[PDB]
A paper describes a structure:
We aimed to achieve orally bioavailable molecules that selectively degrade the BAF Chromatin Remodelling complex ATPase [name] over its closely related paralogue SMARCA4, to allow in vivo evaluation of the synthetic lethality concept of [name] dependency in SMARCA4-deficient cancers. Heterobifunctional molecules co-recruit a target protein and an E3 ligase, resulting in ubiquitylation and proteosome-dependent degradation of the target. The synthetic lethality between [name] and SMARCA4, resulting in sensitivity of SMARCA4-deficient cells to loss of [name], has been discovered and validated by genetic methods, but pharmacological validation and exploitation of this synthetic lethal relationship has been hampered by the lack of suitably selective small molecules, in particular for effective in vivo use in animal models. We found that design of linker composition and exit vector placement could be guided and rationalised by ternary co-crystal structures, yielding molecules which exhibit high potency and suitable pharmacokinetic properties to translate to oral in vivo efficacy.
As a first step, we elected to discover an alternative [name] bromodomain binder, incorporating only the absolute minimum of hydrogen bond donors, a high degree of rigidity and distinct and well-defined exit vectors. Incorporating insights of halogen bond optimisation from an alternative benzoxazinone lead series to the quinazoline core led to the design of scaffold compound 1. Next, we hypothesised that placing a basic centre close to Glu1417SMARCA2 could improve the binding affinity and would also balance the solubility of the compound. The attachment of a piperidine was superior to other linear and cyclic basic moieties, such as piperazines or amino-carbocycles, and led us to compound 3 as a purposefully designed [name]/4 BD-binding motif for [name] generation. Overlay of compound 4 and GEN-1 demonstrates the shift in binding mode from a bi-dentate (GEN-1) towards a mono-dentate interaction with Asn1464. Finally, SPR binding kinetics of compound 3 (SPR SMARCA2BD KD = 46 nM) revealed a similar behaviour as previously reported for GEN-1 (SPR SMARCA2BD KD = 206 nM), however with significantly reduced hydrogen bond donor count. , thus offering a superior starting point for the generation of orally bioavailable PROTACs.
Residue numbers in the entry: 1377 to 1489
């Protein structure tokens, strides 16, 4: 049966909150994470990261009704942030941005659900 309207509305609002988020410096943290690096330019990314995912793919899964619960969506957002932390150095801007986006996802979920 189709996802109920409440679930659909919740996923769009949560992902939009994460993608649109700007820190105290005015920087949109999601920017680098929208699209994966190219397989031709950065093959080492695909050698180390077993399940690559980006926000474009998460938005595709939301659009095509693939997530059946908020937990399903959370699993992919957490995977994206975990991959950023696996590939990139601890303490780097991209590693630290992914930790902030995990927090933004959780806070947005608490406000809509
Ligand atoms: O884990 C990630 N790490 C990175 N990096 C790092 C590799 C090393 C540098 C940062 C990216 C770098 C790019 C360049 C390409 C060429 N033009 C500039 C930007 C593009 C996407 C990148 N990207 C992700 C994109 C989506 C999801 C995840 Br979870 C990641
Ligand atoms: Zn549809
Ligand atoms: Zn794990």
């Amino acid at each position: 049966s189709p996802n109920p309207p409440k679930l659909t509305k919740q996923m769009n609002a949560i992902i939009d909150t994460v993608i649109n988020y700007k820190d105290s410096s005015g920087r949109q943290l999601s920017e680098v994470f929208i699209q994966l690096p190219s397989r031709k330019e950065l093959p080492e990314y695909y050698e180390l990261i077993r399940k690559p995912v980006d926000f474009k793919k998460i938005k595709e899964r939301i659009r095509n009704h693939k997530y059946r619960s908020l937990g399903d969506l959370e699993k992919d957002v957490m995977l994206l942030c975990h991959n950023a932390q696996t590939f990139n150095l601890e303490g780097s801007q991209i590693y630290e941005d992914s930790i902030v986006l995990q927090s933004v996802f959780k806070s947005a979920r608490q406000k809509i659900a």
